[PDB]
């Protein structure tokens, strides 16, 4: 029986989520990771509200607060809908085994190429998260003042006086370890999932162009069975894309809003600071943010384009010599395939690179607004 942890594509994210007991096991680690970070984000937002005085602290806080709120939101959706994610990953494992069992050189090569691509993306995302978390912790050192890794205020509690400060710092550091985790794998997971989508899509394309190979032409029963199988695989791909679409759709509506605000925040911050090396840290923040955004939008766009290329590959087949009925079936396949298998943002807008450019433009506009007001 194929298992979630057996499939290379989803193995890394499954392991990371099972370590915190989000999607595979239930234990105290889930709550130990959720509740402290939720409280941290809440007090971060309170400090943000209370820090209307000076703009620099306001902006850095706001950035960290939005980042951690988005992480917590993603985690809450993941834990709330654990069963659907588990079922999706189990289906991914089953389809991965089925595809791997195929005996086509190009299909296998495509499988391995995309599997290694997904795994490298996941590990690179984890490494980038680790480094950027380290930069998070070391950020308040270069300034010199008694700063904190992330702003936080407790009602009527002094944070810059007495040894209490230190304790906060220390606990904050450990609070970073879950936080980054809770954010990164889902992104990777999306990518990974989308990549498998492409794999599946591309597989059908090959099976669409070679379905008549080794099949007797005289008898129409076997050709009919083969085209029926092709239709069934197309429907399976549609269902996969629809499920991933719903999940990542709500998540990506919230993600679009939060990413717009975060990119605005980082761009404004980079243009105000005057410290020695903190600008490099802000630049690393921007690199992380745009890397996640690009992963999301690029993979969704590829899903769409590969569905349309599925239509094209349906056209480029051995359909000239087939009987009339099989030609009608392939015409219906071309008809359906020309509609992109969109992964929508909040179910309102398909996720493409056009929305990526729009997000960048909106972030830059917000940055210009902040420049004008601050001046």
């Amino acid at each position: 029986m194929a298992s979630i942890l057996d499939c290379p594509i989803v193995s890394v994210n499954a392991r990371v989520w099972r370590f915190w007991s989000f999607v595979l096991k239930h234990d105290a680690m889930r709550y130990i990771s959720i509740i402290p970070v939720t409280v941290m984000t809440f007090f971060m937002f309170t400090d943000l509200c209370r820090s209307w005085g000076n703009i620099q602290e306001l902006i850095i806080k706001a950035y960290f607060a939005v980042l951690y709120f988005n992480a917590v939101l993603r985690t809450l959706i993941l834990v709330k809908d654990r069963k659907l994610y588990e079922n999706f990953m189990q289906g991914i494992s089953n389809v991965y085994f089925e595809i791997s069992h195929i005996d086509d050189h190009k299909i296998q090569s495509l499988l391995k190429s995309y599997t290694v691509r997904a795994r490298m993306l996941s590990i690179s995302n984890l490494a980038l998260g680790a480094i950027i978390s380290t930069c998070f912790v070391v950020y308040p050192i270069f300034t010199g003042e008694r700063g904190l890794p992330y702003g936080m205020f407790i009602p009527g509690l002094d944070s810059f006086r007495s040894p209490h400060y230190e304790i906060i710092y220390i606990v904050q550091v450990v609070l970073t370890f879950p936080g980054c985790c809770m954010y990164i794998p889902f992104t990777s997971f999306f990518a990974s999932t989308t990549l498998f989508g492409l794999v599946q899509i591309k597989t059908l394309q090959r099976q669409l162009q070679t379905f008549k190979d080794n099949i007797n032409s005289q008898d129409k029963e076997k050709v009919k069975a083969k085209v029926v199988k092709l239709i069934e695989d197309h429907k399976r791909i549609i269902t996969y894309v629809s499920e991933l679409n719903s999940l990542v759709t709500y998540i990506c509506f919230v993600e679009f809003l939060s990413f717009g605000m975060m990119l605005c925040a980082l761009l404004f911050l980079l243009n105000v600071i005057e410290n020695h090396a903190q600008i490099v840290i802000v630049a690393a923040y921007i690199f992380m943010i745009i890397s996640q955004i690009f992963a999301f939008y690029w993979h969704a766009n590829e899903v769409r384009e590969e569905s349309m290329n599925l239509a094209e590959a349906a056209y480029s087949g051995p359909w000239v010599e087939l009987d009339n009925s099989i030609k009608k079936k392939l015409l219906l396949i071309i008809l359906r395939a020309q509609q992109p298998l969109e992964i929508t943002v909040g179910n309102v807008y398909p996720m493409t690179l056009e929305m990526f450019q729009s997000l960048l433009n909106a972030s830059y506009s917000y940055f210009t607004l902040l420049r004008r007001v601050y001046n």
């Binding site: 008809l335 807008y349 506009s365 004008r372």
Partner: protein, 391 residues
């Protein structure tokens, strides 16, 4: 037919301020006619008093903008109420469209189930919008009572009235003050009732269309299963009748959609124009906001009401669009390969037809959809950006 399903909404329109002299006994035709005339006269009277009040308050820009926003918001119901009577025939044609629908001895159960679901959702929407309007009026009255009626020019005591208005009466002592209070409460109730009632009628039409599309898909699946085996002549006639039923019902839904677009196609245009103006003025007012208890509350309430109307229209337009697209999807995702030749050609033609989603347009200038709401939100936020930057 469709009148029976929508009777609660039709009565809410009828008995409050909204003409519709079509669905009761001849006895109520004349008294109701006079009542409608009186309602229109009262609304227009208060509208004119508001306008004349705006006339003297044109010296400054803040008061002028607030008055203009109020004038446009109360323009909405006046336009709606003088728009329905002129287009009464098309509205009555939109209704009575489903008086003689198709029928098959096999797809009757799904038809009944989805008809019941449509009626339930219609009632749900009607009650939700009614609650929203009641919340709006009570919130208005509360904010007026807690607000301080002081004008800064020197400080002068403005009458503690719910809507700024120039009244020949004293409007300060008990008599005039209470008369104006009840009159303005009645104005608010009737205006919101008329506007939101016609809007909810439009949305109920859209809900009926969407539920009929869902029925069409849910029977598309067993329809193809029926076609699939090699069929005896009787089965050929049965599948022919099933194809006929599906096509006729889809054409009926298309007729309903076109009728709904015709009846309510230019009310959307006027609504969006008045909105655009109100949103511009409200963006300026928000640029004036500095976190005050009442000013910010009033601006946020105006924005919420406007965006809620636009959002309702866009929600149901998007529902219809996605329902047509899903019709295509559910036509594909079935066992159409084992179906007879006629059923396969029927699926081909249905898929070709469903390439484009049904939509409602503001007189062909735009389409009501969540894309339109997103564009409106983007435009308002961009104009607010420009206003704050240009300070």
């Amino acid at each position: 037919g469709l009148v029976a399903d929508l009777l609660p909404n039709i009565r809410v329109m009828q008995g409050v301020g909204h003409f519709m002299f079509n669905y009761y006994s001849e006895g109520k035709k004349f008294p109701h006619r006079i009542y409608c005339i009186v309602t229109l006269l009262l609304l227009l009277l208060q509208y004119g008093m508001m306008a004349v009040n705006l006339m003297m308050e044109s010296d400054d820009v803040d008061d002028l903008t607030a008055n203009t926003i109020t004038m446009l918001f109360f323009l909405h119901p006046i336009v709606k109420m003088i728009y329905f009577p002129v287009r009464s025939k098309i509205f009555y044609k939109t209704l009575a469209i489903w008086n003689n629908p198709n029928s098959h001895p096999l797809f009757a159960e799904s038809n009944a189930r989805f008809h019941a679901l449509a009626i339930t959702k219609m009632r749900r929407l009607l009650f939700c919008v009614a609650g929203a309007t009641i919340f709006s009026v009570i919130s208005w009255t509360g904010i007026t009572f807690i607000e301080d009626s002081v004008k800064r020019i020197t400080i002068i005591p403005i009458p503690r009235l719910m809507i700024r208005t120039f009244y020949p009466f004293n409007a300060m002592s008990g008599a005039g003050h209470v008369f104006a209070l009840i009159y303005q409460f009645y104005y608010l109730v009737i205006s919101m009732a008329v506007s939101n009632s016609l809007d909810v009628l439009f949305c109920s039409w859209l809900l009926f269309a969407c539920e009929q599309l869902q029925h069409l898909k849910a029977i598309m699946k067993p329809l193809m299963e029926l076609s699939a085996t090699g069929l005896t002549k009787k089965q050929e006639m049965l599948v022919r009748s099933a194809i006929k039923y599906w096509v006729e019902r889809h054409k009926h839904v298309v007729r309903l959609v076109t009728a709904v677009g015709d009846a309510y196609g230019v009310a959307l245009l006027l609504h969006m124009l008045t909105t655009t103006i109100t949103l511009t003025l409200l963006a300026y007012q928000a640029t004036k906001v500095n976190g005050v208890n009442v000013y910010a509350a009033t601006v946020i309430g105006y924005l919420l009401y406007t965006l809620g109307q636009v959002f309702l229209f866009c929600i149901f337009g998007n529902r219809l669009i996605e329902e047509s697209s899903s019709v295509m999807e559910a036509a594909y995702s079935c066992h159409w390969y084992d179906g007879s030749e006629e059923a396969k050609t029927f699926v081909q033609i249905v898929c070709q037809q469903c390439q484009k989603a049904m939509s409602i347009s503001g007189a062909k200038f735009f389409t009501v959809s969540l894309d339109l709401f997103a564009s409106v939100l983007g435009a308002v936020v961009t104009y607010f950006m420009v206003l704050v930057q240009l300070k």
